[PDB]
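Why run this: before we spend reagent on co-expression, it is cheaper to look at a predicted model of the complex and decide which construct boundaries make sense. The entries below are exactly what would go into the expression plan.
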Amino acid sequence: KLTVNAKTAVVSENRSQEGILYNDPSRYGKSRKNDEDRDRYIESRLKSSGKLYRIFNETDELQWFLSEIVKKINRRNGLVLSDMLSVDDRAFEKAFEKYAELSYTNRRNKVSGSPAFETCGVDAATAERLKGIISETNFINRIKNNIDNKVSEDIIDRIIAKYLKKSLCRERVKRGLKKLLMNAFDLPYSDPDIDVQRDFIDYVLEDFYHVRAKSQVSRSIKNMNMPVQPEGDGKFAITVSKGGTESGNKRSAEKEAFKKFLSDYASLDERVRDDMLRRMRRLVVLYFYGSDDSKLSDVNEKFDVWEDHAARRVDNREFIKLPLENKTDKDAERIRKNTVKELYRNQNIGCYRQAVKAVEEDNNGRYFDDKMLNMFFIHRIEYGVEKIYANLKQVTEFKARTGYLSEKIWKDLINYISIKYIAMGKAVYNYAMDELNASDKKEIELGKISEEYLSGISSFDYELIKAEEMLQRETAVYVAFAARHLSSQTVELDSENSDFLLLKPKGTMDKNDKNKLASNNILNFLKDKETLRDTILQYFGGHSLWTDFPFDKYLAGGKDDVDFLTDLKDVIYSMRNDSFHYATHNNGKWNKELISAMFEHETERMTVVMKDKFYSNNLPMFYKNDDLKKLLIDLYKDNVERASQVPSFNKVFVRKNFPALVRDKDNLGIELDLDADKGENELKFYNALYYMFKEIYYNAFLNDKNVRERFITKATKVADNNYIAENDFGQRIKNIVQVNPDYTLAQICQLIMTEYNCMQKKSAYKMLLLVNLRKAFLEFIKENYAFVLKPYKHDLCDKADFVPDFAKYVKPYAGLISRVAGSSELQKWYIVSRFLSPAQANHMLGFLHSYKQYVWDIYRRASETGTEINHSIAEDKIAGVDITDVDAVIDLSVKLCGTISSEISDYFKDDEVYAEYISSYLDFEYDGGNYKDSLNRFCNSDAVNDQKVALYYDGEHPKLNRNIILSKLYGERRFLEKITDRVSRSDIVEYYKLKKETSQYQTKGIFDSEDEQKNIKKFQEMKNIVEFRDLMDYSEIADELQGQLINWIYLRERDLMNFQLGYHYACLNNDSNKQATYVTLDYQGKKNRKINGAILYQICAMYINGLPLYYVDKDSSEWTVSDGKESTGAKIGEFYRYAKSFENTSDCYASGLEIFENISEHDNITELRNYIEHFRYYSSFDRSFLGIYSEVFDRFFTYDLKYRKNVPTILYNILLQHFVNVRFEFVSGKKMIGIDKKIAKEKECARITIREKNGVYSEQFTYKLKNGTVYVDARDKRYLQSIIRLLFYPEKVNMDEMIEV
RNA sequence: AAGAUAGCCCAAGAAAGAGGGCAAUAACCAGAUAUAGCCUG
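The model came back. Tokens follow.
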């Protein structure tokens, strides 16, 4: 990358913008580059490549022969341009550079022929010498100097396709080089249209001296800008470049014409938009089908553009003729693909020149009146064709069809209109809707640009927006999951009442018969009202922990546990569509005293929980309680707010290598001296030490002052004295600490990891961070916790005897308790996070960390560049609440969500119900009597030899399995049954046999032989099965697949609002006919208010929880205002009743949405959105995850190609994160158009599936041994089978054929 | 309907041009919640 030293940004001063280069990290006054320094920086980066410049870049006999030819050409005395042009003590370097500039200038000024050196400051005699140096004869001699071999035309072809430098990979340059090489090797060859001197040699000189980048790159950076900027009259519009050159001025004029198109197209009169789309459609038909196409003959024919679109798509006409296939020879296929790309380019050039001519000659009403608008679209069309072939992955016949290309370009032009209206709405929503903020103003004005942004938008401004929108979208996913988990055990929904958050309180009656309950009254759906409180308290750790809590104090009067459930439902709902940007918000409808009291009650157990984890992790088995007490107070006296982008403990201390690293004398030298319980006690110790070090790592190590100082000195050792990398890594650390000496260790890690950072996850600075953190932690242990070096096995004390005086030394939650009591917003974060799975709560916490670090980094870079920035996005607060408080709240949920009660009665009604529930995942040979006795006999039966089954029983009762209860609270039972097989006796037999085989080398960590490593992996796989750990893995994968779908839902909903905002903002600001209430609402009710820019206010009100909407009520037929808390679906209906008077349209809500989507599928989009967010998949299983992702790819992101075309890759990445590699196959399925209430028709749909044979394979783990290295499948066939079932259910496939081994 | 594995902005450009930028835009990278599960780099 050219600008690898620096970063770019866009700054705006007084409605004028400038792209800048700046060094990072740096200080104000030393970061932003001035004009001259920007110019010399680019120039310096270009000249730093001249001496390594080579025409060619960089096992089989032929492939290895081609590499030897390239190397010999690139060697000394070969084609080394720096040696050739610096001859005679560099006396001719300036003349050669001047020649290269004149050669380029002659091209863009259309002067034929190579420049004469006499015009490069050189006499006629020297000119003859220089011309000879860069002649074909001399190039041939340099090429031949190190080669004494025979080649062919095909060999030269393969060398050019595989090794020619990218900057030289243009058709005429490649043909010039081929002609040169054939002449060099005395092979007969003819290419009469090509001149070796002008087409290859002269161009190589232009490329060697970088004459294009030298004269253009710096100016192109300075003229960069944002998508939207204010105009003179304080209106947002798409940004138009300033131009400055002949081609730049024409380009800006075309862009101004399209800006007028966006203004004129925003018309409620659909006939106006219909006519404009028809003219754009005729440009597409002209481009691909010529001026004599039948749809261009009659200028006044109002043909259906969409029916023409469908007709062309199935046309068999060929855009180019593809060459025949090759006799796979991958070198031959690359040559063929390059030939195919040139065929596309030549035909695309022909189509362009023909369309430009026909637009100028035979318009007369066919196209747009503005010629610059026709040219803008023709340039878009040519660019769209190039987008298709420039990154062609494989030559296919369908992609060579004219109808495929014309219709891809048609949707491409509509895409461009869609993203520009969305871009306009983005600027309007964030910067021109200030008076949405709750106020006492009786008259407000929407759509006026806030004062801080009238001078324009900077790139830092949009980085802040991204940070906020990312966290908002991530939080919307967990709101949905919290609602799902709360509903899963309390209510049973139906298809008509499938959104738990929209159920109504127990007193809600039917509107048309007040004698009956409302259909959505929560009473109609309760699974068991008499156990409702205990069912809810399962998610608060079990009701046994609440026997002292005065529920009746808060549920007094006629309130009961149904109001308890309703209050929790109301908390979660108040966070849905709760905008971080506009406060409507801090006074919840629910019982704030009850929720606050439950929070305080939960903080009171936190010290007990954290010290219990020391006990449960067997730390008091190897260390003195007094030494552990000291550590507990150190770690948990204060709530620790973790920073993002710090390497995780598990990456610094890999668990596999942990026993060996602990015993190493150079690290810690810990040896535990220990009968039958020997190997089991060593395993307990290393597991205990691993948990203790992890807690130390996060709660004491990372923030220690002495640790940071010694980290810096050690990391910069090699710098002040792999060896290549540690020197550069050390110098980077030195630069960081010089810029700011107060940077924390986390901030140094963040800055390093920044420059360390392709859309696809890759299958098979960071290490030096890991190594230096590892070394610093070991010394921190030796300096501050020396007692850990001397473990001693002794009997475990009683759980209640382990540091019972812990609470009296620490009070970490003292201040937070009162702040939650007075903050409805804090209570929202509490309840939403509290109802997540432990893994989800952890992810939510990580997203908060990434948000805080992002905002801090934006303001850091804005400050060093001297860029004034509005602080609407705070570094320390979110939605008016301290991020530190939100962090502590989510962290409490993370810990308590994973703390399962020890009482079976907290989750089940007796041991028999629990045993039967276990039978859904374990086949303990149920005879038919009672499940409890069947399980007890199973565990008491012989497994292998002298070993009983055991595992699942704890004395007189079945053993409480942590993974079983977590799947009950947070997982989906029917889903897990349908994708997995129950644990069997043979599983347990194989478990115990592998436990015995590995019992002698289990804690060796890193192993000697290949058979030892494979048997260890096999035992770990069997342990995961018998402990139901694979069950949790599948549940998390499903949660990640479902979470991404919900993420996409709120991505689309944001952009639908932005499209509507930008479109109606453009309509408000054009001269088209607009009715009174579209512009101004004058509401005269008791809550009177005058709304200027009413359409914009009402659009945003549809999407913001708490923003009231003005409408004419159904039953009263009079104007009213809502409280703003009604559902999105209710607000859409209300918006229709606000616009129902509109006389220039039948549907204001849908105006312009033909650009955003296919209107005929609008209700199908709503159905898919509801299907996902209401978790209908887990109740019906009518579609597969692959089928849901397929429909999203097919029609959920019609509004923006960059989201649609990444949908399959995102799915591929999620699976690869769990070490599953899948190979996609894109085929056909079915989808409905419309919803029956009875006009729905069926149509073809995109179907993403997996290749039938060898479509799924596991990633390989690289397992280092003592001497060698072995590769083992990360996931066995049984794991891959459940992944396939997860993706395909209810569809069944041949998994023996699909899985590759 | 689709056959994905980007998209946009600046520059260049008709004997085409094809040089730069993007935490701005999604993805990517990173994140450890619980007891042998995310190795390697």
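The two ends of chain A are 39 Å apart (CA to CA). The CA atoms of residues 815 and 885 of chain A lie 9 Å apart. Bring this page to Monday's planning discussion.
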